[PDB]
From a paper:
Sirtuins constitute a family of NAD+-dependent enzymes that catalyse the cleavage of various acyl groups from the ∊-amino group of lysines. Sirtuins consist of a highly conserved catalytic deacylase domain of around 275 amino acids that is flanked by unstructured N- and C-termini that differ in their length and in their sequence. Of the seven members of the human sirtuin family, Sirt2 is mainly found in the cytoplasm, while Sirt3 is the main mitochondrial deacylase.
We obtained well diffracting crystals of Sirt3 in its apo form and of Sirt2 in complex with the product analogue ADP ribose (ADPR) in diverse crystallization conditions. Again, apo Sirt3 crystallized rapidly in diverse conditions, over a wide pH range and at different temperatures within days. The formation of the apo Sirt3 crystals was therefore dependent on the presence of microseeds. Sirt3 crystallized in space group P21 with six monomers in the asymmetric unit. All monomers feature the typical sirtuin-like two-domain structure with a larger Rossmann-fold domain and a smaller zinc-binding domain and adopt the ‘open’ conformation. However, they do show some differences within the asymmetric unit (r.m.s.d. ranging from 0.2 to 0.8 Å for all Cα atoms of each monomer). A similar behaviour has also been observed in the published crystal structure of human apo Sirt3. Similar to the published X-ray structure of apo Sirt3, the acyl-lysine binding site of all monomers is occupied by a PEG molecule. Using these MMS apo Sirt3 crystals, we were able to solve the X-ray structure of apo Sirt3 at a higher resolution than in the deposited X-ray structure.
Author numbering: 121 to 391
The structure:
Amino acid sequence: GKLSLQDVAELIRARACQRVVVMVGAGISTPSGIPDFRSPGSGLYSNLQQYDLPYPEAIFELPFFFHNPKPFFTLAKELYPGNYKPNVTHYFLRLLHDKGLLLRLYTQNIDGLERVSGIPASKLVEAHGTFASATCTVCQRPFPGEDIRADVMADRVPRCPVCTGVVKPDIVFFGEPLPQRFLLHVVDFPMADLLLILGTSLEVEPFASLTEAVRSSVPRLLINRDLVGPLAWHPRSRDVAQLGDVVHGVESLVELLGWTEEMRDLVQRET
Ligand SMILES: [Mg+2]
Ligand SMILES: [Zn+2]
């Protein structure tokens, strides 16, 4: 390709990339042991098979939730903050933020590990929602996710202190609109001077096609097992793919940036 991984690192070292936009998916959190509720032979999957569900995805369907919210709250309990820990990929993104280079981080994940790694909410677009906040299904009052933590950990369906309605985490269910902050793409993508794509199969719209929203003068760096989605289908001259294990790819980039010590120190502070 006209650009290498090292070329991208050198742009960053020269401070030519002050406004990095990042897109991440499930691939970045596999190293943290996040279980896939859809995958046969996880504890979460087997746990979900005691409920009268037609398929595991029904836990993200509203008509099922209002019939019985307990299956969804089983997933909430497993993925609620505290259970899992960020990995090097998350800390790399935290370093980008610390260095003042992160414009915005778009995530498909609901594991909340970006927040745990210390990336401020204002830098995040959690495209599938989050457990950091919740909303009463009846009166629409917002609450911090901490307010329902105890109920969640005790297998009690959390209820609103005003109207007693079920309080549901701000996780996006099928048919629901994307979160309001998704429309930050309108300003972020035209402004980006680098796009980083990590650990996503780019199979789902409209998240996938955000890759096309950056300018053609702007490099798109993919760190992923494979070349996927619009990057595969509509490649551009300044695209760079570092294909293989995501953690190995990130560590390669860290080396080319010359950020080995800072990563070491960050990780040690956080762990
Ligand atoms: Mg209460
Ligand atoms: Zn209420």
